[PDB]
Structure formats: structure tokens, C-alpha cells
């Protein structure tokens, strides 16, 4: 071989897109749950008195 | 005074440590207090948990739905009847005279003149010549809200 392979060599810009959408979805659900906790803990802990 | 029957005590190691009260076809009981309600039909129901109000609440079964208290959030300041006596409501605070109530009086409904419950007592703090009650009430909009004067100690 005339070149050196690296770990991020075989990712083919759709596999990148897939790990992007996967991590984005995972983080999005988690962060949505966090914002849900925020809003419930805001309207309930405060803002009922 | 006469409607106080529908609150029934809980038994913990054989002694009464609190009371469970039925309102709106829903039986309630403070979380902090442990035991089994002293009657059979209400002993059965799996009581769901509400930590943020310190209240276990359950759906009273069928055949005594019409045998329960009513409640409103309409609470003008003034004197309101309660098991041991009157409770004066003022400056958005329920307060009973000094020394009355204590350990074991948790879950005790506080009624108004017309028998409608205004709050369930969960604790207290003795301030000066009075003692203010930490209760669970319903606000002007009528959603449930725990009201705690600072330093309330559970009963």
C-alpha cells in the first residue's frame, strides 16, 4: 500500500449521516425529556402559588 | 363535627398514627405516615403515590361513591371547623391554637361551615401563641397545592 489508513477512512458520507441521525435522535429524545422535566417542575413547583 | 366519621384511622404496629380521609370519591392518606387504614373495603385498594404533595391517593371502590365529602377552593379568611376545634384562616395561612394537634393528627380534614373540605392537614409549626398548619389545599384556580409555613414538622 502506498498510503496509510486511518480509523475515519471507510465512513462513506451516508454512514456518517446515519451515525449523525442516530446520535441526534438519541440526544434529542434525552434533551426533550430534560426540557419536559424543566417545564413540569416550573409550572408545578412554582406557578401554582 | 358530624361528618368527621368519614375519616378513618390507620394502624401502625397496632396504634393510630394518622388518618385517611375520603373526598371526591377518592381516598387520601399522608405518605409520610405508615399503616393500614382501619376498615376493610378501603384497605384493599392499591394506593397510588404523589410524592410532591406527600399524599397517597386512591380510587375508592364502587358501592360507597355517594358517601364521600365534597370540596371547594373557595376559602374566604375566617374560622373553619376542624376535629379538635376551629382553625382561623388569615394571610393565606391556616392556624390553630397552640398545642392542639400534633403527632397522629395528620390526614385530618379541615372543613368549612357547609361541610366541604378546604384542606387536609399534614404538619405544623408552633409560632408564638398559635400553631400554623402545613396542609394540602387547592388554589384560587383550584389545582392541588401543598402549603407549608417555614419549619413545619410532619405529624
Swiss-Prot record, chain A:
Residues spanning the membrane: 26-46
Membrane topology designation: Single-pass type I membrane protein
Post-translational modification remark: N-glycosylated.
Signal peptide: none
Cytoplasmic side: 47-49
Compartments (UniProt record): Virion membrane; Host cell membrane
Assembly description: The precursor of protein E3/E2 and E1 form a heterodimer shortly after synthesis. Processing of the precursor of protein E3/E2 into E2 and E3 results in a heterodimer of the spike glycoproteins E2 and E1. Spike at virion surface are constituted of three E2-E1 heterodimers. After target cell attachment and endocytosis, E1 change conformation to form homotrimers. E2-E1 heterodimers interact with host VLDLR or LRP8/APOER2 to mediate viral entry. Interacts with 6K protein.
Function of the molecule: Class II viral fusion protein. Fusion activity is inactive as long as E1 is bound to E2 in mature virion. After virus attachment to target cell via host VLDLR or LRP8/APOER2 and endocytosis, acidification of the endosome induces dissociation of E1/E2 heterodimer and concomitant trimerization of the E1 subunits. This E1 trimer is fusion active, and promotes release of viral nucleocapsid in cytoplasm after endosome and viral membrane fusion. Efficient fusion requires the presence of cholesterol and sphingolipid in the target membrane.
UniProt protein name: Spike glycoprotein E1
Provenance organism: Eastern equine encephalitis virus
Residues of the full protein shown: 1191 to 1239 of 1239
